[PDB]
UniProtKB/Swiss-Prot annotation:
Keywords: Cytokine, Cytoplasm, Inflammatory response, Lysosome, Mitogen, Pyrogen, Secreted. This is Interleukin-1 beta. One of its GO terms (biological process) is positive regulation of fever generation. Potent pro-inflammatory cytokine. Initially discovered as the major endogenous pyrogen, induces prostaglandin synthesis, neutrophil influx and activation, T-cell activation and cytokine production, B-cell activation and antibody production, and fibroblast proliferation and collagen production. Promotes Th17 differentiation of T-cells. Synergizes with IL12/interleukin-12 to induce IFNG synthesis from T-helper 1 (Th1) cells. Plays a role in angiogenesis by inducing VEGF production synergistically with TNF and IL6. (Microbial infection) Cleavage by S.pyogenes cysteine protease SpeB promotes its activation independently of CASP1. SpeB-mediated maturation of IL1B plays a dual role depending on infection site: while IL1B inflammatory response prevents bacterial growth during invasive skin infections, it promotes streptococcal infection of the nasopharynx by disrupting colonization resistance mediated by the microbiota. The record marks R4 as: Involved in receptor binding. Belongs to the IL-1 family. It comes from the Eukaryota. It comes from Homo sapiens (Human).
Amino acid sequence: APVRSLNCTLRDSQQKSLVMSGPYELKALHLQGQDMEQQVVFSMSFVQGEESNDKIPVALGLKEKNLYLSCVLKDDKPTLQLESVDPKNYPKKKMEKRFVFNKIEINNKLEFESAQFPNWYISTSQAENMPVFLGGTKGGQDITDFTMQFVSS
């Protein structure tokens, strides 16, 4: 298929699920049971960019929503945001760089690095119900690895 996609959910390494905060933010919280259908389903697209065996460029959109994770400078700092796109032009194989994340298979885990801001990663806090953000430091306080769960579309 022109741009190929797969539906999935992401969980941080502390088993926190992702849910929609406002219309333009994601939050991470400990969910289980019925409250699980609250989780965001992503449409991961395999876009063009520099690839390797453990580094694959992807675009992360919300399933059946014209909203994508984007990396932009805000108050002179790489920041994560959900951005709206023309529902007729996306997804595309050649997504603008702000939308591209390098999906890196490390442990049994995944890391999502901004293609635009090298060494800037999708991160979650240790604390409950805090927004998903772009973090510039791996290996400490904040969580930078996830597991992916495939959903049947």
